[PDB]
């Protein structure tokens, strides 16, 4: 059960709805999609790394601090300072889960959370009749994020040792491809390092009664009724197009899929499944929904 640390050194576009949108972290959907596409480009075998690997979402880091999302847990006291907060570092996470975090501490933690800044870079497209005759340029915009020299994102993955060796090989392949949007236009390369942090391991290997969903999951048909007994959760319409399925890219677009967010809390665990969002295509297109649980 190793974790991967990602350093970029080139600004990245990650996207939610429009190319001028900017997002900091991405979900296991896009990550698993990227690993799948690089496995196919390598021409390796896909069965091994389809139904054995569990991936958590991306989570940012700073110099020596690692971050996990806020559990949507019901704290009984402001209801303001906690709302403006998204992420809680590993040092104070058990403190948060047990009410040992104070409002001034919330303000301080928010104050220290400078881990990147946003930007819109302008661009123009002169493939149009500006080649031919008097015709206006068509400026467009892209949304980017840049990390300070000691920031990045990290993963948490688990599985058999063989699965993790394969994951290492594919990640080596991927570091020179991208992990974002306009990869081919100069955004989103990275170098990765595998480090074993004692504290994160301790946090991952507890035992409790609740569960904090660290990835984006959706229970299968026959478990959802007992899965949703007592829970606090946010759903997100996850959409997007597909790469090399049919003739027209504009005509091909995955059916919308809803999954629980990366902070939901549950009583009864559910295993997930890799769900097809496929139709009118030549090959199946996969979306990822399998949880990585944090048990406390």
């Amino acid at each position: 059960t190793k974790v991967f640390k990602l350093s970029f050194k080139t600004p990245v576009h990650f996207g939610k709805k429009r190319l001028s949108d900017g997002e900091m972290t991405i979900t296991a959907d896009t990550l698993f999609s990227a690993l799948f596409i690089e496995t196919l480009q390598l021409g390796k075998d896909t069965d091994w790394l389809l139904n054995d690997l569990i991936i958590s979402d991306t989570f940012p880091y700073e110099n020596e601090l690692y971050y996990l999302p806020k559990p949507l847990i019901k704290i009984d006291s402001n209801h303001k300072a906690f709302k403006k907060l998204k992420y809680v570092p590993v040092h104070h996470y058990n403190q948060y889960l047990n009410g040992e975090l104070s409002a001034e501490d919330a303000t301080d933690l928010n104050d220290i959370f400078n881990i990147g800044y946003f930007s819109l870079q302008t661009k123009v497209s002169l493939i149009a009749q500006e080649t031919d005759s008097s015709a206006d340029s068509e400026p467009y915009s892209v949304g980017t994020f840049t990390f300070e020299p000691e920031a990045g994102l990290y993963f948490i993955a688990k599985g058999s040792e063989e699965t993790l060796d394969h994951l290492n090989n594919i990640m080596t392949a991927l570091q020179y491809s991208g992990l974002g949007g306009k990869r081919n236009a100069g955004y989103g390369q990275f170098e990765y390092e595998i480090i074993n942090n004692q504290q994160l391991s301790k946090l991952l290997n507890q035992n409790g009664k609740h569960s904090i969903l660290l990835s984006t999951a959706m229970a299968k048909k026959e478990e959802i009724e007992s899965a949703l007994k007592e829970a606090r959760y946010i759903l997100t319409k996850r959409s997007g197009f597909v790469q090399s399925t049919n003739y027209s890219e504009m005509l091909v677009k995955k059916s919308d899929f809803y999954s629980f967010s990366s902070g939901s809390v549950f009583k009864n665990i559910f295993n997930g499944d890799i769900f097809n969002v496929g139709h009118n295509g030549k090959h199946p297109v996969y979306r990822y929904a399998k949880p990585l649980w944090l048990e406390v």
Binding site: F118, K253, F257
Partner: protein, 695 residues
């Protein structure tokens, strides 16, 4: 008349006699308020209903002692209601005090201000108001089942600054309109609770013995209800098209009117009056309703229908959550500060029943609909909705229609055909006042929602408050123009300004409020009304001399967009004018940025005092502007070399800047002041900001 309507029409006029006694020129019965009000109402044909007269004439203990009324007579509920809403020398000239002083007076008690320094009212004013209300009462008011909202509106129009109780020993901050409204609300709630819970001889249920009376205060006969729009931000700020100005003023308004129609329709279901609405704005609404099984069953069913609708069009972008909590009338009289406990409890229940939003079968249905769909509206960043011509769906085009129709027409109508799609199988179209009338005698089941216009008195006249201002119509062409219509200003760079503001101390103010002594339902209600009316009229007036169009304003959110210079000037003006109205008790935090024209406005929104006014704008900016005005040839080149020296904070650069200023031809005073400022860090940052503003 229905007995509930009898409670309504009687209660809202229980303390009417006060305005009559305080008049002095109308004191026919100089004995008590009750008898005088009874005599006054007793000349008019429409309000010639008798039980209403009894209600008004008997609103107090002593009078009721001998009226020999039935064990069921509506006035008794009026008595308990006035007590709930609530040595006694009433000075007719007592000036009303603004609640905003008392709020943060605990820390800093300032000289109690007052409405119209040491102002005082005068006798003839009340006589004039008597004339006015007799005029309206002969010519505008009429008694039918459905005119109660109209009566409430006229009370609102006439009374909002006539002091309710003028007791010299009490902190006078309640308008008589507030007292009357909350009394009517409480009366309605009591009537439903008693009628439902199988009690009929109310004289014996309540009045008989103070111990039994005190029990009734203790019984949990009231429910407080809450509302919350879930997905405000992502619905309002998903725009990329060329009609950015036109849509936003219309999308914001469509969401607002959605909230209003939801709350009105709910009130219609529960057979309650518009008085029971205590606060609307943003996404929240608070309702005070009856604590019966019937009401709760209806609430559950209505929540079901609403959630099914909102899934049937949006599925994540907008959802509504409601929650209610039992509360006892003893808690409304600020007995143990427990009002604050119950209010926080209902807030927590809302914030924790927004967690579990969708049932199992619901989330299955969301995921298993393989449907032939087209793609994302250029104007409205949404895929699920079904586009048409120009890559736009029907909803976005209806929004564009209402956008075009906003500027010239004022009345808004809820009907079966309309243009835009409303929750419970309704639609909205747009009309004019003559057209509104024509619909009125047509007796169509209509509601009129207006553009901050009273003196309507037309059908269901519902003066809904929304700040619609746009300098873009002050040009030679009255038609609404694009976002470039402010970009093209030549007095500076051709850029846009956007301003966002939040009240810093607003969570505490609605929750904590004034400690330990003014924490009733009445006093927090009047504070709510004051803030609401401030953000829904005062902005409209304050923004007049400014080239700004008002986008979304209300609650505690201030979202204005316009020309760069104008946004700064208007922001300063608004901050000062607010500090005036809140008597320097509440503070505002605001951000203004420079955004280029033709950016997707969805993206500029996600980007976004005494010190700035006195030190930067007033002194440094003025001397700098005079300096450049006196000496020509100081183009952007000279200023930008000044920047080049300044931003690199080095002493060799200070010498270089000295050389540059020496080579300029400014007066010795200007150069000397600039150099002295340049030697100091705080001053030089301020100087940088000021000269940047010059450009």
């Amino acid at each position: 008349m229905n007995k509930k309507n009898i409670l309504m029409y009687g209660s809202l006029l229980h303390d009417i006699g006060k305005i009559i006694y305080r008049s002095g020129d109308h004191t026919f019965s100089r004995g008590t308020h009750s008898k005088l009000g009874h005599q006054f109402l007793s000349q008019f044909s429409e309000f010639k209903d008798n039980e209403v007269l009894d209600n008004v004439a008997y609103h107090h203990y002593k009078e009721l002692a001998k009226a020999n009324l039935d064990n069921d007579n509506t006035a008794y509920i009026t008595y308990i209601a006035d007590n709930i809403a609530s040595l006694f020398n009433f000075d007719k000239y007592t000036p009303l005090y603004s609640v905003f002083n008392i709020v943060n007076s605990e820390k800093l008690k300032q000289t109690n201000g007052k409405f119209k320094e040491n102002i005082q009212y005068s006798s003839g004013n009340y006589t004039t108001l008597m004339k006015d209300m007799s005029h309206d009462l002969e010519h505008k008011l009429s008694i039918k089942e459905g005119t109660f909202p109209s009566l409430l509106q006229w009370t609102e129009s006439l009374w909002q600054y006539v002091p309710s109780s003028t007791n010299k020993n009490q902190l006078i901050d309640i308008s008589l309109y507030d007292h009357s409204r909350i009394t009517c609300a409480i009366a309605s709630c009591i009537f439903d609770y008693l009628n439902e819970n199988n009690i009929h001889n109310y004289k014996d249920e309540l009045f008989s013995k103070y111990e039994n009376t005190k029990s009734f205060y203790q019984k949990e006969a009231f429910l407080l209800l809450s509302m919350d729009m879930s997905g405000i931000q992502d619905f309002i700020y998903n725009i990329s098209g060329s009609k950015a100005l036109k849509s936003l003023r219309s999308r914001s308004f469509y969401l607002e009117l959605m909230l209003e129609v939801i709350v009105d329709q709910l009130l219609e279901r529960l057979e309650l009056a518009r008085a029971n609405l205590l606060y609307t704005g943003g996404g929240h609404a608070y309702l005070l309703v009856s604590n019966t099984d019937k009401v709760k069953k209806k609430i559950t069913q209505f929540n079901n229908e609403l959630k099914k609708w909102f899934m049937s069009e949006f599925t994540t972008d907008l959802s509504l959550s409601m929650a209610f909590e039992k509360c006892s009338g003893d808690d409304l009289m600020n007995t143990s500060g427990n009002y604050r406990t119950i209010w926080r409890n209902v807030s927590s229940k809302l914030s924790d029943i927004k967690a579990h939003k969708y049932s199992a079968e619901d989330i299955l249905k969301l995921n298993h609909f393989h449907s032939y769909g087209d793609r994302e509206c250029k104007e409205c960043l949404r895929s699920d909705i079904d586009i048409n011509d120009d890559g736009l769906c029907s909803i976005c085009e209806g929004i564009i229609n209402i956008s075009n129709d906003l500027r010239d027409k004022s009345f808004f109508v809820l009907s079966e055909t309309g243009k835009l799609k409303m929750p419970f199988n309704k639609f909205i179209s747009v009309i004019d006042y003559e057209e509104a009338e024509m619909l009125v005698q047509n007796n169509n089941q209509v509601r009129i929602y207006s553009k901050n216009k009273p003196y309507i008195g037309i059908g269901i006249s519902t003066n809904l408050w929304m700040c619609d201002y746009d300098y873009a119509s002050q040009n030679q062409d009255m038609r609404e123009k694009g976002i470039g219509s402010y970009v093209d200003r030549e007095e500076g760079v051709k850029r846009l300004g956007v301003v966002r503001a939040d009240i810093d101390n607003l969570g505490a103010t609605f929750i904590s409020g004034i400690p330990e002594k003014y924490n009733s339902i009445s006093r927090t209600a009047t504070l709510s009304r004051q803030l609401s009316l401030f953000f829904k009229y005062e902005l409209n007036h304050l923004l007049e001399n400014y080239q700004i169009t008002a986008i979304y304003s209300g609650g505690d959110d201030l979202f204005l967009i316009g020309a760069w210079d104008d946004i700064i000037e208007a922001s300063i003006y608004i901050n000062d004018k607010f500090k005036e109205f809140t008597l320097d008790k509440l503070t505002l935090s605001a951000g203004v940025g420079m955004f280029s024209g033709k950016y997707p406005v969805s993206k500029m929104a996600f980007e976004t005092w005494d010190e700035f006014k006195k030190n930067i704008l007033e002194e440094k900016l003025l001397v700098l502007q005079q300096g450049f005005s006196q000496t020509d040839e100081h183009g952007k080149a000279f200023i930008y070399k000044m920047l080049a020296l300044l931003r690199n904070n080095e002493a060799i650069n200070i010498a270089r800047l000295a050389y540059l200023l020496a080579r300029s031809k400014m007066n010795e005073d200007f150069t000397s002041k600039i150099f002295n400022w340049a030697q100091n860090d705080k001053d030089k940052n301020q100087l940088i900001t000021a000269l940047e503003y010059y450009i």
